[PDB]
Design an enzyme around this catalytic site. Structure first.
Site, PDB file in Angstrom:
ATOM      1  N   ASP A   1      -2.590 -15.971 -23.426  1.00 26.54           N
ATOM      2  CA  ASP A   1      -2.158 -14.995 -22.361  1.00 26.54           C
ATOM      3  C   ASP A   1      -2.845 -13.657 -22.500  1.00 26.54           C
ATOM      4  O   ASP A   1      -2.465 -12.819 -23.340  1.00 26.54           O
ATOM      5  CB  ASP A   1      -0.630 -14.819 -22.419  1.00 26.54           C
ATOM      6  CG  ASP A   1      -0.101 -13.942 -21.269  1.00 26.54           C
ATOM      7  OD1 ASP A   1      -0.830 -13.741 -20.267  1.00 26.54           O
ATOM      8  OD2 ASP A   1       1.036 -13.492 -21.377  1.00 26.54           O
TER       9      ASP A   1
ATOM     10  N   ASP B   1      -5.915 -11.730 -16.168  1.00 26.52           N
ATOM     11  CA  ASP B   1      -4.636 -12.311 -16.810  1.00 26.52           C
ATOM     12  C   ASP B   1      -4.579 -13.871 -16.868  1.00 26.52           C
ATOM     13  O   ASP B   1      -4.213 -14.483 -15.864  1.00 26.52           O
ATOM     14  CB  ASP B   1      -3.408 -11.855 -16.007  1.00 26.52           C
ATOM     15  CG  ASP B   1      -2.138 -12.194 -16.684  1.00 26.52           C
ATOM     16  OD1 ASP B   1      -2.196 -12.816 -17.801  1.00 26.52           O
ATOM     17  OD2 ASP B   1      -1.088 -11.861 -16.121  1.00 26.52           O
TER      18      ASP B   1
HETATM   19  C1  LIG Z   1      -3.323 -22.420 -13.897  1.00 27.47           C
HETATM   20  C2  LIG Z   1      -1.927 -22.154 -14.435  1.00 27.47           C
HETATM   21  O1  LIG Z   1      -1.905 -20.903 -15.174  1.00 27.47           O
HETATM   22  C3  LIG Z   1      -0.644 -20.645 -15.721  1.00 27.47           C
HETATM   23  C4  LIG Z   1       0.510 -21.430 -15.491  1.00 27.47           C
HETATM   24  C5  LIG Z   1       1.729 -21.056 -16.061  1.00 27.47           C
HETATM   25  C6  LIG Z   1       1.731 -19.941 -16.895  1.00 27.47           C
HETATM   26  C7  LIG Z   1       2.885 -19.355 -17.564  1.00 27.47           C
HETATM   27  O2  LIG Z   1       3.977 -19.883 -17.717  1.00 27.47           O
HETATM   28  N1  LIG Z   1       2.702 -18.051 -17.926  1.00 27.47           N
HETATM   29  C8  LIG Z   1       3.666 -17.253 -18.554  1.00 27.47           C
HETATM   30  C9  LIG Z   1       4.872 -17.771 -19.044  1.00 27.47           C
HETATM   31  C10 LIG Z   1       5.823 -16.874 -19.586  1.00 27.47           C
HETATM   32  C11 LIG Z   1       5.521 -15.508 -19.688  1.00 27.47           C
HETATM   33  F1  LIG Z   1       6.423 -14.662 -20.289  1.00 27.47           F
HETATM   34  C12 LIG Z   1       4.269 -14.982 -19.244  1.00 27.47           C
HETATM   35  C13 LIG Z   1       3.959 -13.494 -19.336  1.00 27.47           C
HETATM   36  C14 LIG Z   1       4.461 -12.820 -20.624  1.00 27.47           C
HETATM   37  N2  LIG Z   1       2.545 -13.206 -19.244  1.00 27.47           N
HETATM   38  C15 LIG Z   1       1.948 -12.960 -18.093  1.00 27.47           C
HETATM   39  N3  LIG Z   1       0.606 -12.727 -18.101  1.00 27.47           N
HETATM   40  O3  LIG Z   1       2.584 -12.787 -16.903  1.00 27.47           O
HETATM   41  C16 LIG Z   1       3.964 -13.193 -16.752  1.00 27.47           C
HETATM   42  C17 LIG Z   1       4.586 -12.813 -18.099  1.00 27.47           C
HETATM   43  F2  LIG Z   1       4.507 -11.439 -18.228  1.00 27.47           F
HETATM   44  F3  LIG Z   1       5.912 -13.073 -18.069  1.00 27.47           F
HETATM   45  C18 LIG Z   1       3.366 -15.879 -18.652  1.00 27.47           C
HETATM   46  N4  LIG Z   1       0.623 -19.241 -17.072  1.00 27.47           N
HETATM   47  C19 LIG Z   1      -0.525 -19.550 -16.549  1.00 27.47           C
END
Ligand SMILES: CCOc1ccc(C(=O)Nc2ccc(F)c([C@@]3(C)N=C(N)OCC3(F)F)c2)nc1
Ligand code: NA
Ligand code: NA
Length: 381
Positions: A37, A224
């Protein structure tokens, strides 16, 4: 430098559930799959038997665990986690051959954080200390890595999009040249908190949206890997959807499609990719008055939705969406490109990804240089 055969293909995932890397924590090592992430800065792993988790960190089994006696409560827009801070030894098996003592947040309670049916059980925040929870004195993983070892201060991500499995490469300490074609073009990191950048121009099928460019970065733009969509500030999203709708007029769709409120489906094998326009973002370049541009295809921003248990066909979600947190270049931009997080020189490089999904008429593209004036005005203060 340039060739990291042990790290190529060290990412896995399922469509729509994100890309994760295998890591180990503790002594003896405990193996966990960790979401990559670039939009956060905490290393936080499930530490209790939540029913969605395959595996979780069991501190009592690690002889090298040290408790920091400090909790952390982290609410997000939807969902939350809460955990206890500590440090332990961490390795990446398909990464450099080193062990780091790193901060870990052992997650003991969460809500809407873990995904039911996903194969990962923690998150690796790769951005800077400034957005670390609880505060910037909690050193992020990558900073600990660079402090304690000789690993160079950069990493690079190749996210390859596709029940269906996705894959990719995270090259830690370098760049692998087989992962991209043409040249890398670099944009400055405007400030080290998120991987914040500045967009200076937006075109739909080569047509400029013509907005004041500060609207493109209101209130920031970031790169991101932990977000699926291309998110755009509300005003920019309205203009962009309006161009996209005009560009694809040869078919009509319900309004709800463009808002991500319903899917659209065509019969198998016949998605008319060619009625949809390409989208270009010009980014601030390295030199005064100089920019370059990255272009993605509908193959990136129309995402296949596999698990529609009430349809036969090929259904897609529109994956460009309105934002109130500024522009978010999520997996929709990144699956076009090989992306270099060159922290030592505070810049982010883009090159056409050697694995990106395309057809025989069009391909993702990174092109320059272009002459763009007043790029400093495009940043929001
Ligand atoms: C192509 C698919 O890409 C993705 C699919 C699912 C996910 C996913 O679950 N991301 C995800 C899950 C929990 C979370 F807490 C986060 C945090 C901290 N990080 C980012 N940048 O934004 C949301 C968030 F701040 F909360 C991301 N990510 C990418
Ligand atoms: Na060092
Ligand atoms: Na190359």
């Amino acid at each position: 430098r340039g060739s990291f055969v042990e790290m190529v293909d060290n990412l896995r995932g399922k469509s729509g559930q994100g890309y994760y890397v295998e890591m180990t924590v503790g002594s003896p090592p405990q193996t966990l799959n960790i979401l990559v992430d670039t939009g956060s800065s905490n290393f936080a792993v499930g530490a209790a038997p939540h029913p969605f988790l395959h595996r979780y960190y069991q501190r009592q089994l690690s002889s090298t665990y040290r408790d920091l006696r400090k909790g952390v409560y982290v609410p997000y827009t939807q969902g939350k986690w809460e955990g206890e801070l500590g440090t332990d030894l961490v390795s990446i098996p398909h990464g450099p051959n080193v062990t780091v003592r790193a901060n870990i947040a052992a997650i003991t309670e969460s809500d809407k954080f873990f995904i039911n049916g996903s194969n990962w059980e923690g998150i690796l925040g790769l951005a800077y200390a400034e957005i670390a929870r609880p505060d910037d004195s909690l050193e992020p993983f990558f900073d600990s890595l660079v402090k304690q070892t000789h690993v160079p201060n950069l990493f690079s991500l190749q996210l390859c999009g596709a029940l269906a499995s996705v894959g990719g490469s995270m090259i830690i300490g370098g760049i692998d040249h087989s992962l991209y074609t043409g040249s890398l073009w670099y944009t400055p990191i405007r400030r080290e908190w998120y991987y914040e950048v500045i967009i200076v121009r937006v075109e739909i099928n080569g047509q400029d949206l013509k907005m004041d460019c500060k609207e493109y970065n209101y209130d920031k733009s970031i790169v991101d890997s932990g977000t699926t969509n291309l998110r755009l500030p509300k005003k920019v999203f309205e203009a962009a959807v309006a161009s996209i709708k005009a560009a694809s007029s040869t078919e009509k769709f319900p309004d709800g499609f463009w808002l991500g409120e319903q899917l659209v489906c065509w019969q198998a094998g016949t998605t008319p990719w060619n009625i949809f326009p390409v989208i270009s973002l010009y980014l601030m370049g390295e030199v005064t008055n100089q920019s370059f541009r990255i272009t993605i295809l509908p193959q990136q921003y129309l995402r296949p939705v596999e698990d529609v248990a009430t349809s036969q066909d090929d259904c897609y979600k529109f994956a460009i969406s309105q934002s109130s947190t500024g522009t978010v270049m999520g997996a929709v931009i990144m699956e076009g490109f090989y992306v270099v997080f060159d922290r030592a020189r505070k810049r982010i490089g883009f090159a056409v990804s050697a694995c990106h999904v395309h057809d025989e008429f069009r391909t993702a593209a990174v092109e320059g240089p272009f002459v763009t004036l007043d790029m400093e005005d495009c940043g929001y203060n």
